[PDB]
Amino acid sequence: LGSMTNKELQAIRKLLMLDVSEAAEHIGRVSARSWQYWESGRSAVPDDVEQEMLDLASVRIEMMSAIDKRLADGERPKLRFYNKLDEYLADNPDHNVIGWRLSQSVAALYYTEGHADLI
Amino acid sequence: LGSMTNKELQAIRKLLMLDVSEAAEHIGRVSARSWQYWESGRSAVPDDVEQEMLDLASVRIEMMSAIDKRLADGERPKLRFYNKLDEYLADNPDHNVIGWRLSQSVAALYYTEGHADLI
């Protein structure tokens, strides 16, 4: 911790399919312009933001591990790709827009690489 | 060809880190509104668009295999993460914005999987 660069921050943010405005609001609790400064290198990536991003990446890893278990158990998963945030929130009433993006990132990865169907 | 769904189209587009405006201009050769129509589910996805998306997914796989070859050769790759399109284009003068986004998707993946560092 204390080593995350502006490029690493943007890389994780985009891999999790977050828009800047979504990361700024729910992770940084800063203006979108402030988040852009962290990604541009104009201001250092804060320690607390770094750890929050790593924690969110870890959530995605746990989601992928759960699908890997289903794959090893012989299931070809049918993964919900929520193109609609309202539909995701109805099915996942304890999550928010950030959970929606993580869901999309995992479903899109397994579909595009040939391991899962999308529903 | 002819069976790609709106969810599959959006999933591949987002995994490749393409904005709708970018995909619409360069892949669809249509307006953003037309591309949003294809992602809305009221329409079949055109065969030519499906083929191009599948081809770009294959380009992404070949980029990953090229890094895998470097890893197998004993290199610890320092992948340039381009947070600025212009810098990518200067380094890759035969590519466009679509190639930029593919480069971001591959670099972000290998960084988070722990296989390469970002510069």
Swiss-Prot record, chains A, B:
Report the GO molecular function annotations. DNA binding; metal ion binding; RNA binding
Q: Which domain of life is it from?
A: Viruses
Q: What is the effect of changing residue 48 to A?
A: Specifically abrogates RNA-mediated translational repression; no effect on transcriptional (DNA-based) repression
Tell me which UniProt keywords the record has, alphabetically. Answer: DNA-binding, Metal-binding, Repressor, RNA-binding
Comment on protein domains: The N-terminus HTH domain is involved in DNA binding and inhibition of transcription. The C-terminus is involved in dimerization.
Q: What do we know about how this protein assembles, alone or with others?
A: Homodimer.
Task: Tell me the protein's name.
Answer: Aca2 repressor
> Which organism encodes this protein?
Pectobacterium phage ZF40 (Bacteriophage ZF40)
